[PDB]
């Protein structure tokens, strides 16, 4: 047909990409960090237009990973540290009412601390949990903290909130975020319903283990979703299609002291409590979650076979904070016994532990002292999702809590998103030429 | 009137009549990463600009030249090609040639640069 | 001549008169704060040059377009406005159309665009 | 076909045809510094990008304008430049010259536009 | 009691030492030149610089 070459720029096409993303939204998150969100939800349908989605090969979920770790390290870096008070403690029961499952869980321990002068001291009384310091052989003492033969221990700044907020990833120009707005999305392969965004809705850098808390729902049904469901090595994500509600407290009245340590510097303890102590704890409707884990066998047997017994189990071992629910709640940092929400074969109450003195991540060589808050504690969650994992080990499969590897934590969001680059330029035949 | 790529879709005849709506989505320590992410946006968006230059592009959007099409690169018909493909299944089928037809649109500039300036150094 | 914005307070008809004066001084941690000027400062320039592309007036700084004026954006004579107001009057004056006459520039490139490439197709 | 700089040691004629090898390749605390070299580049590539287009040269690497040579910049014949020359003892010779003839340059595409503006107002 | 105390360089002088405000490109500082300014409202005279004094 004698035809030419025409070059078109602007042309609506695209190739998989990772570029960095930026971030828009007193607060660990979205200080000065982020950008102001643009009030307008610009969300474009693409019809006809079907796109290959991975949510395990997504980098928007490194980043987010990089982002909220570099961020947490920012907040904490310019604040008190603690390393005056790794001394010996001496440590003796709390003379306070005292519930069975309290018994030597909470000490009250006394030490000598460094003041405002460097030649002075003060003695001081404070109250710890026995997960924070363990035994020391002294004169004059019986315990330290857990961290001091590790890291030092930096106190996260009074009123810098760990509270959640919704970050929203946004794309520089020429780039665009495209969405799958597909129901029941297996979270992998071809996605039909997709639709372009500028960026995402608004994710909350929330941590938890095991639990998923205020995510997002599936649109109609529970989705399974795993890199290789085959493999028990890998994690299984499961979004839920209704919320379960889980209300988690620490029922006892703290009253809460601070000392100088030094010029401008400033530690956070408990001083006392007031009323009896009792364990802090969660509670989830039995009923809710009978449902709940109803629907969840019902989704996997679709991939293990229709006529399988299902078995839930507790974690298998290993540290606290991935045999337990972990979570924050009112700045504290509870430790959640599970093993009643996943003992069964196909109101509960769940004890936990509290802990002031955290690794953030796997990573050693970092330490933060979280303060207590005055008060009593309670807080409403929704459960949105769960990570679980199979057995290795034939017939009856048995799925147990997941760990806390954060990346998770973020692939329960950012699953339906994916990073592209706009390629503006093309070419093509046509029956136009010069002159 | 669909809005940034909302003619990924169409046609590439249809889409063709939307480079204007997503041709201006192109331009428009935490403040590394932000500016790093606005000097690569110029660094594509100029680039793309000086290739069209190359080509004697500048300044336009649907640029006509004087490279054949020799029918191995894709020996589609323009009907499939404009009313029964999109831009997204065009640019896979010949993603292959594109650094091929890209040279030859460099030559072909070169040589009609070179013809101008001939014809206007007649008297 | 007069100097970078030496023109300013001149009338329509004299300012248009110096518009690569204008046009040259438009280009040219604390490093933040320095790139980020810089990077606004090209981001801004390259902004209006695409948005001269749109229009095909990219190359130009007087272009001459296909658009009619409507006499609801502006009434006065053409002797009134280049004679007798200055352009920081008129900027004013037409602020409330400038969206849209943007609109219909683009609107009136993207049909002179497609009607030259089927003139180009004509053998 | 040469390289980047193959051309350098050429005559000037030989040379004027890699214009476009040249071309292609002028756009491609840690941070800082990828970003300072990066954003200058930017603006060297912008800044000789809008001189060309104050010349009304822009789009292209050869342009021809209505600026007369005069004799007292280089009163060598063209079989002593665009042979037996190479690019780099010209730009030696024409240093002093260089803000005159941009100068030049930049009145000539005023008066030509302001022509093209009344020409195309004719009816 | 509340501040760290920490001791100035004993090389680094707090001389005042002018500066000059410099616009980026695309933008300029507009002077006012009357004389008897009282900081606010039009200025007649005007000049374009693109440092401060
Ligand atoms: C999942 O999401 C839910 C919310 O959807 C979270 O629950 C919220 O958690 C935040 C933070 O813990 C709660 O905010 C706190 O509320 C306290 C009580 O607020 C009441 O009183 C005030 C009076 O002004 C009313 O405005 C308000 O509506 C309530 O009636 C405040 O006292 C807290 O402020 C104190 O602590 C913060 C610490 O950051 C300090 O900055 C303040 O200065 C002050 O000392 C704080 O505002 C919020 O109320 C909870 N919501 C609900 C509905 O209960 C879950 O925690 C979250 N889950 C996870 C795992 O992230
Ligand atoms: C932790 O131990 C300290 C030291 O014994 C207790 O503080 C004393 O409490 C008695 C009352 O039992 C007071 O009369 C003393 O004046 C307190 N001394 C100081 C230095 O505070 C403290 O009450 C104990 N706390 C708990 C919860 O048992
Ligand atoms: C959570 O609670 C369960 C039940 O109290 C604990 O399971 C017990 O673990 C011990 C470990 O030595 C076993 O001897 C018991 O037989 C288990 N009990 C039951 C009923 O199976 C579990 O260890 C607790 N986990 C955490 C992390 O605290
Ligand atoms: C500023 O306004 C003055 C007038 O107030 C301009 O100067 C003269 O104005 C008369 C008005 O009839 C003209 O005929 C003269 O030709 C103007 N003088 C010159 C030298 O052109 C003055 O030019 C205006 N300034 C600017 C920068 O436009
Ligand atoms: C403290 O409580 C623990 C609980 O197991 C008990 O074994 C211990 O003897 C108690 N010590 C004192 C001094 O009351
Ligand atoms: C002290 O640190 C070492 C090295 O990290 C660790 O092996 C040891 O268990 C720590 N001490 C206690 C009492 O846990
Ligand atoms: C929990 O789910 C309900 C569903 O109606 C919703 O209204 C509520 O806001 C959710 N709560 C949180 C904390 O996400
Ligand atoms: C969907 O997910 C399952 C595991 O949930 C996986 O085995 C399968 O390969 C995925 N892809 C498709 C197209 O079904
Ligand atoms: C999943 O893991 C099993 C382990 O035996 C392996 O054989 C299979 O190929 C894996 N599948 C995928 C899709 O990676
Ligand atoms: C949990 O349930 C128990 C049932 O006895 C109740 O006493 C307790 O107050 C509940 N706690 C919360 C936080 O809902
Ligand atoms: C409640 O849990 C038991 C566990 O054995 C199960 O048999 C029963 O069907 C569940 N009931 C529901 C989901 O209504
Ligand atoms: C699991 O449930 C059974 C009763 O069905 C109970 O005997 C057992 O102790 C429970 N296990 C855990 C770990 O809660
Ligand atoms: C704790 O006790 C103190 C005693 O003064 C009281 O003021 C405070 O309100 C109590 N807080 C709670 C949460 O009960
Ligand atoms: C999608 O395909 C249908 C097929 O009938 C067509 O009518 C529609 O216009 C297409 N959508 C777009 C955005 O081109
Ligand atoms: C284009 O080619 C297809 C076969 O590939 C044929 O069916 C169709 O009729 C051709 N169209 C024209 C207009 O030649
Ligand atoms: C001018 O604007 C008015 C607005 O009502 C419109 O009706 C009219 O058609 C426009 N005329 C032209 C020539 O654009
Ligand atoms: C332009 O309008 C003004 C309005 O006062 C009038 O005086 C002037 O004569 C008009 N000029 C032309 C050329 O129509
Ligand atoms: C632009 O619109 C506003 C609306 O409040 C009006 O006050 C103003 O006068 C209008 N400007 C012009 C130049 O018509
Ligand atoms: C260098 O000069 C020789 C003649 O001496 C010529 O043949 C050769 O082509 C020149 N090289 C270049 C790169 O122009
Ligand atoms: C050439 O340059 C000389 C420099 O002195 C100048 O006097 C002369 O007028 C210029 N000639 C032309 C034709 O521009
Ligand atoms: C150019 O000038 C040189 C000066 O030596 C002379 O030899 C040569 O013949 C001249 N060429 C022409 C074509 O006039
Ligand atoms: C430019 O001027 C300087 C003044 O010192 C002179 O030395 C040099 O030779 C001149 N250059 C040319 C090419 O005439």
């Known amino acids: 047909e004698n035809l030419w070459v025409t070059v078109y720029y602007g042309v609506p096409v695209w190739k998989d990409a990772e570029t960095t993303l930026f971030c828009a939204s007193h607060n660990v998150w979205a200080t000065h960090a982020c950008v102001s969100t643009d009030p307008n939800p610009q969300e474009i349908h693409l019809e006809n237009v079907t796109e290959e989605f991975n949510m395990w090969k997504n980098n928007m979920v490194e980043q987010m990973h990089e982002d909220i770790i570099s961020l947490w390290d920012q907040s904490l870096k310019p604040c008190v540290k603690l390393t005056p008070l790794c001394v010996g403690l001496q440590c003796t029961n709390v003379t306070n009412n005292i519930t069975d499952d309290m018994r030597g869980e909470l000490k009250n321990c006394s030490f000598n601390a460094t003041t405002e002068l460097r030649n002075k001291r003060q003695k001081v009384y404070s109250l710890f949990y026995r997960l924070d310091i363990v035994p020391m052989v002294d004169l004059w003492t019986n315990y330290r903290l857990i961290s001091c033969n590790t890291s030092a221990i930096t106190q996260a700044c009074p009123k810098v909130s760990f509270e959640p907020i919704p970050i929203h990833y946004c794309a520089p120009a020429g780039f665009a975020i495209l969405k799958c707005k597909d129901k029941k999305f297996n979270g992998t392969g071809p996605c039909q319903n997709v639709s372009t965004v500028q960026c995402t809705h608004g994710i909350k850098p929330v941590v938890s283990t095991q639990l998923l808390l205020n995510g997002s729902l599936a649109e109609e049904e529970v989705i399974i979703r795993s890199e290789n469901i085959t493999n028990n090595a890998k994690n299984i994500l499961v979004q839920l299609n209704t919320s379960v509600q889980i209300n988690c407290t620490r029922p006892n009245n703290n009253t809460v002291k601070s000392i100088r340590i030094g010029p401008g510097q400033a530690f956070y303890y408990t001083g006392d409590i007031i009323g009896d102590i009792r364990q802090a704890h969660c509670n989830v409707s039995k009923a809710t979650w009978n449902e709940t884990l109803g629907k969840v066998v019902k989704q996997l047997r679709k991939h293990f076979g229709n006529n399988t017994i299902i078995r839930f189990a507790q974690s298998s071992g290993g540290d606290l904070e991935v045999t337990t629910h972990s979570f924050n709640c009112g700045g504290e940092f509870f430790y959640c016994n599970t093993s009643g929400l996943f003992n069964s074969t196909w109101s509960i109450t769940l004890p936990c532990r509290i802990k002031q003195i955290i690794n953030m991540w796997q990573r050693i060589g970092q330490a933060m002292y979280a303060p207590p808050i005055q008060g009593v504690i309670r807080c409403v969650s929704n459960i949105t999702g769960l990570i679980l994992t199979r057995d290795g080990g034939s017939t009856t499969e048995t799925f147990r809590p997941g760990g806390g590897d954060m990346r998770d934590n973020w692939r329960s969001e950012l699953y339906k998103y994916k990073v592209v680059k706009i390629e503006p330029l093309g070419v093509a035949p046509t029956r136009c030429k010069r002159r | ?123």
């Not at chain 2, 669909?2 to 249809?14: E, N």
């Not at chain 2, 460099?106 to 300036?117: G, L, T």
Request: hydrophobic content about 40%; aromatic content about 8%.
């Open chain 2, 1 to 123: 009137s669909l809005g940034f790529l909302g003619a990924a879709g169409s046609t590439m005849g249809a889409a063709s009549m939307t480079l204007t709506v997503q041709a201006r989505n192109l331009l428009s320590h935490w403040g590394i990463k932000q500016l790093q992410a606005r000097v690569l946006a110029v660094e594509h968006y100029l680039r793309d600009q000086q290739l069209l230059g190359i080509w004697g592009c500048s300044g336009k959007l649907i640029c006509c030249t004087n490279v054949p099409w020799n029918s191995s690169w894709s020996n589609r018909n323009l009907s499939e090609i404009w009313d029964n493909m999109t831009w997204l299944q065009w640019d896979k089928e010949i993603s292959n040639y594109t650094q091929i037809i890209y040279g030859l649109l460099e030559e072909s500039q070169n040589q009609q640069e070179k013809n101008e300036q001939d014809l206007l150094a007649l008297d």
